[PDB]
């Protein structure tokens, strides 16, 4: 629909043939979805596996090696050789493909996190009377959609009717208007008008700041205002994490030093260039020792270390989502394992938000100035209308008490919520606010008129007794809740009439703070008597006792205005006269309701203790109840002293600032606070360098969620509060936060053990190739042999590391320090110490066959250093058998073997093998065998060993490879040992 904003409101409905009252029928939706398509942008998806391997072969080093190989073959044509350039390519192509799959799976996984929370909108369609919450991509033009405060607007929408006094919208992401703007519903005559002047439209991707409204969808998909903009570009933020840079810089540093050592190996040979390689023509001598130099370069320059950070993320964030922690900001995953304080809200995060009225009272006798109370309890704590009203633990019929009748009448009419039976889950579920639906179930359980419900079905039984009260009193309007009075009320009139605009009542429900001052009378049965001091004090005293004990009940005060003002004399635009509309009240009773602790919170808070993480409840109960709840869930002790560890927001506002900063250091419970207080707290905690995770759900939580180190939004919450956040909890659970923090720590250790493996494996490669030249030895490894080993390790054991378990005793440690360097000075030692051993061993293996080997040439302490020409016969009276495949097949062997051993070493950062055995990761064990079966493959086949220049090894030879390799596990175990105890690691 074009220029909806210029068409009037009847005209938009008319254009699509849709009713405001019902919405699109199922058919209309199909037709319009056929015609306009989904509310999406087309999936771009432009990349290919073919292209990416080619794109990998565009860096210089890889081309150079291929050039060196080509040239070497052409030159020595005069008299493999040729297979070398071909197998180099193949291995490089092999390694490339593996590296591409690696990279792309990681990208897709990260991108897939968006699937855990699809954009949703609310529509009205004809097949259900209620509002429906559908995936937004299934919203079509002509849909009647609904928006309210906190929502992210699902399509371009003409506004139909403003349910508030004001609708107020944040369209900054669109128009740049940083402040919120207001909207109306009259038409904007100019068709060519500019977005900011369409004060009657709500554009897609835009937040609502205040208000509720109903509209008709005019355009979806690319046709939207933001669609036109999003279609141009991306527009991709394009990385990278702060840790990714700190480690990137270390990559640059290291990469440099490897370049220097790679040039330096060339110059060791620069005098050897004319020795027969052969017979030492300078160009052939040059290019040979230059394949080596650049081979080591390509194979050992590390590599894509940010690739490692963007893989542990992809693994870990997947895990967190499967555990209800949906990560929005990837940077925060690093700082998550640093969390040191968690402020959490109570209702529905530490508790469960399953309300249930489970005590209640009304007035009994009233003698002079004192009163008796009639006081009952109710069983059943789900929403199911199954349970009984007891008195003195004796079941009783609630209608026998006229006071109870009126208390139930109030709970049915001051209610905007309802019960619905879920025939698929087979359970009674809520519709609307939990605290209200708890009143709904109570009226069902009470059944004050004794209507015949035993024989109805679950579905019709679900609101049976409530419907009878409505059949009795017509609710005409509602005086919506306001803070100035802490109550709400409904103006009802009697069922049957013929004008007759009289007989009426107002039923008022709210907090005792608000309601009681406004009661002049007390209802005793059906009679009424003057409210007085000791009566007031008596009611209050019981509300207190219920708050501070055992089940800690939040209480509602229910009252009635027996002679309300005339319908003609009331006005609902300004909320602030309702406290005077609700005066001259008559007290009726009190409902007290339960909101049970989460089942896993108590044990969760204990885990935060073990892991040095402070937990701070921020609730809205009065202080007394709040503290009772903290004791119940283990924040406080059964008899702990806390007159300085828990604050009312008002109490907190009278401490000088000096002492507010103080309180925040010891406080674990804040009650009845303002949204301003969330930021205030974060500020103070920040001054002690504490990493704070704050929860939130409403638009007003946005500032503190932004300001916190880690903002954590409720999934049941608002779109507005989630954008502010780094994590969304799918299940609103506190325990989810702690599992998030644990995985944070787990991922970080997995990063640390990934890179320890990459660096030490690369360092050894550099060492052996260096020693073999610096000492004047024969090449322990042909360039071809290197890339092979490097292919196998990056493909099997390296990948297999991603599937490690969380390190042990990971939360019996305190929070990591922010700014604690990623690579400790000490740690770099291990990278070198282990790495050196690899290189030392691999050449120490080639050196061994050349000396102490019984089937080898006895050269004990004799110069293998001696120049490879060696036909002179000055120390040999043989002669050039130095080009044997045997020495290399120990070098290649020890290398391949150590790489596996040093992979077992990468199971934990500090933890031993006798504590985290080789079999903690089977995939690793699997991969080692898979590797080992290839090494054994290229060894024995017979065509291939000629290309790889290798000879078989008997059980006499593979033995030594144990004695040479295995102590790398010894060595690292020693290193790890010094760590665990001395290093405090």
């Amino acid at each position: 629909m074009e220029a909806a904003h210029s068409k009037s409101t009847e005209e938009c409905l008319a254009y699509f043939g849709v009713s405001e009252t019902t919405g699109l029928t199922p058919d209309q939706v199909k037709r319009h979805l056929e015609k306009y398509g989904h509310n999406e942008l087309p999936a771009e998806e432009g990349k290919s596996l073919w292209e990416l391997v080619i794109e990998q072969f565009e860096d210089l080093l890889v081309r150079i090696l291929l050039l060196a190989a080509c040239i070497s073959f052409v030159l020595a044509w005069f008299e493999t050789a040729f297979v070398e350039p071909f197998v180099i390519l193949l291995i490089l192509i092999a390694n490339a493909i593996v590296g591409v799959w690696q990279e792309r799976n990681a990208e897709n996984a990260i991108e897939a996190l968006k699937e855990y929370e699809p954009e949703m909108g609310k529509v009205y369609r004809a097949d259900r009377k209620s509002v429906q919450r559908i995936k937004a991509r299934d919203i079509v033009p002509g849909d009647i959609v609904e928006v309210a405060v906190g929502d992210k607007v699902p399509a371009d929408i003409r506004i139909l009717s403003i349910k508030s006094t004001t609708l107020r919208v944040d369209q900054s992401i669109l128009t740049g208007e940083s402040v919120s703007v207001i909207k109306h519903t009259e038409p904007v005559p100019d068709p060519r008008a500019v977005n900011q002047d369409k004060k009657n439209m709500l554009f897609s991707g835009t937040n609502i700041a205040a208000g509720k409204a109903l509209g008709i969808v005019a355009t979806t998909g690319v046709s939207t205002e933001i669609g036109k903009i999003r279609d141009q570009m991306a527009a991709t933020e394009q990385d990278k994490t702060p840790l990714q840079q700190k480690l990137d810089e270390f990559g640059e540093q290291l990469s440099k030093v490897i370049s220097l050592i790679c040039v330096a190996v060339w110059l060791i040979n620069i005098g050897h260039f004319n020795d027969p390689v052969h017979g030492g023509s300078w160009i052939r001598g040059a290019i040979y020792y230059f394949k080596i130099a650049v081979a080591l370069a390509v194979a050992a320059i590390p590599e894509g270390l940010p690739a490692v950070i963007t893989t542990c993320l992809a693994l870990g964030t997947r895990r967190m989502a499967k555990k209800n922690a949906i990560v929005r900001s990837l940077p925060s995953v690093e700082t998550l394992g640093c969390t040191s304080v968690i402020c959490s809200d109570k209702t529905g995060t530490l508790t469960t938000n399953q309300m249930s009225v489970c005590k209640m009272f009304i007035i009994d006798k009233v003698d002079g100035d004192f009163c008796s109370l009639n006081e009952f309890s109710i069983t059943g704590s789900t929403y199911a209308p199954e349970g009984e009203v007891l008195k003195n633990d004796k079941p009783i019929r609630s209608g026998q008490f006229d006071g109870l009748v009126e208390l139930a009448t109030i709970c049915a009419l001051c209610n905007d919520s309802s019960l619905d039976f879920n025939e698929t889950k087979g359970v009674y579920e809520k519709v609307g606010e939990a605290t209200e639906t708890a009143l709904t179930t109570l009226v069902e359980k009470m059944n004050v008129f004794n209507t015949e419900v035993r024989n109805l079905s679950k579905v019709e039984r679900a609101n049976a007794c409530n419907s009878v009260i409505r059949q009795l009193m017509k609710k005409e309007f509602t005086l919506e809740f306001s803070r100035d009075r802490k109550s709400m009320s409904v103006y009802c009139s009697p069922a049957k009439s013929s004008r007759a605009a009289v007989g009426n009542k107002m039923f008022v429900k709210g907090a005792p703070e608000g309601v009681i001052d406004r009661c002049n009378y007390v209802r005793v049965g059906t009679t009424r008597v003057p409210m007085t001091g000791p009566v007031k004090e008596k009611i209050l005293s019981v509300i207190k006792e219920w708050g501070t004990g055992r089940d800690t009940l939040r209480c509602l005060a229910l009252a009635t205005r027996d002679t309300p003002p005339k319908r003609e004399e009331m006005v609902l635009d300004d909320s602030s006269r309702f406290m005077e509309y609700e005066t001259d009240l008559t007290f009726v009773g009190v409902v007290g309701m339960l909101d049970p602790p989460r089942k896993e919170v108590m044990g969760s808070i204990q885990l935060c203790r073990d892991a040095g993480i402070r937990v701070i409840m921020i609730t809205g109960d009065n202080k007394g109840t709040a503290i009772a709840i903290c004791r119940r869930i283990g924040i406080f002790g059964e008899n702990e002293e806390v007159a300085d560890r828990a604050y009312t927001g008002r109490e907190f506002d009278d401490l000088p600032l000096a002492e507010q900063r103080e309180a925040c250091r010891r406080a674990c419970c804040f009650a009845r606070v303002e949204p301003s207080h969330k930021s205030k707290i974060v500020e103070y905690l920040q001054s002690y360098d504490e990493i704070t995770a704050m929860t939130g759900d409403g638009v007003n939580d946005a500032p503190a969620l932004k300001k916190a180190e880690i903002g954590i939004a409720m999934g049941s919450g608002t779109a507005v509060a989630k954008t502010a956040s780094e994590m969304v909890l799918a299940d609103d659970n506190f325990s989810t936060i702690v599992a998030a923090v644990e995985e944070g720590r787990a991922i970080y250790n997995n990063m640390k053990q990934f890179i320890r493996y990459l660096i030490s494996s690369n360092v050894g490669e550099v060492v052996c190739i260096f020693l073999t030249a610096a000492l004047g030895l024969p090449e322990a490894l042909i360039p071809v042999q290197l890339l092979w080993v490097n292919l196998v390790t990056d493909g099997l054991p390296a990948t297999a590391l991603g599937f490690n378990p969380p390190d042990l005793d990971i939360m019996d440690r305190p929070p990591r320090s922010p700014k604690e360097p990623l690579i400790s000075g000490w740690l770099f030692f291990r990278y070198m110490a282990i790495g050196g051993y690899v290189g030392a061993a691999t050449v120490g293996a080639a050196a061994w066959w050349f000396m102490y080997a019984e089937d080898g040439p006895g050269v004990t302490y004799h110069q293998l250093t001696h120049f490879m020409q060696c036909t002179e016969d000055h120390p040999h009276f043989d002669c050039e058998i130095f080009e044997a495949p045997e020495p290399m097949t120990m070098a290649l062997s020890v290398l391949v073997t150590i790489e596996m051993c040093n992979a077992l070493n990468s199971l934990s950062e500090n933890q031993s093998l006798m504590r985290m055995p080789p079999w903690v990761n089977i995939w690793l064990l699997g991969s080692i065998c898979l590797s080992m079966s290839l090494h054994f493959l290229i060894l024995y086949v017979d065509p291939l060993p000629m290309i790889f220049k290798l000879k078989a090894l008997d059980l006499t030879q593979w033995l030594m490879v144990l004695k040479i390799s295995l102590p790398v596990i010894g060595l690292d175990e020693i290193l790890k040992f010094i760590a665990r105890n001395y290093l405090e690691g």
């Binding site: 040729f82 297979v83 071909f86 197998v87 193949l90 291995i91 192509i93 092999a94 493909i97 593996v98 799959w101 799976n105 997947r318 292919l791 196998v792 493909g795 099997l796 990948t799 297999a800 991603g802 599937f803 995939w923 699997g926 991969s927 898979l930 290839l934 493959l937 290229i938 086949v941 065509p943 291939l944 000629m946 290309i947």
Partner: protein, 31 residues
């Protein structure tokens, strides 16, 4: 997810198919 074990198996396949081609290139150039 068992997508992890598939990832490792598919890696092992490539470096096997790679080693295969060289057995195929040896005989091919030989005759």
């Amino acid at each position: 997810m068992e997508r992890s074990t598939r990832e490792l198996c598919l890696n092992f396949t490539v470096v096997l198919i790679t080693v295969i081609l060289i057995w195929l290139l040896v005989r091919s150039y030989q005759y």
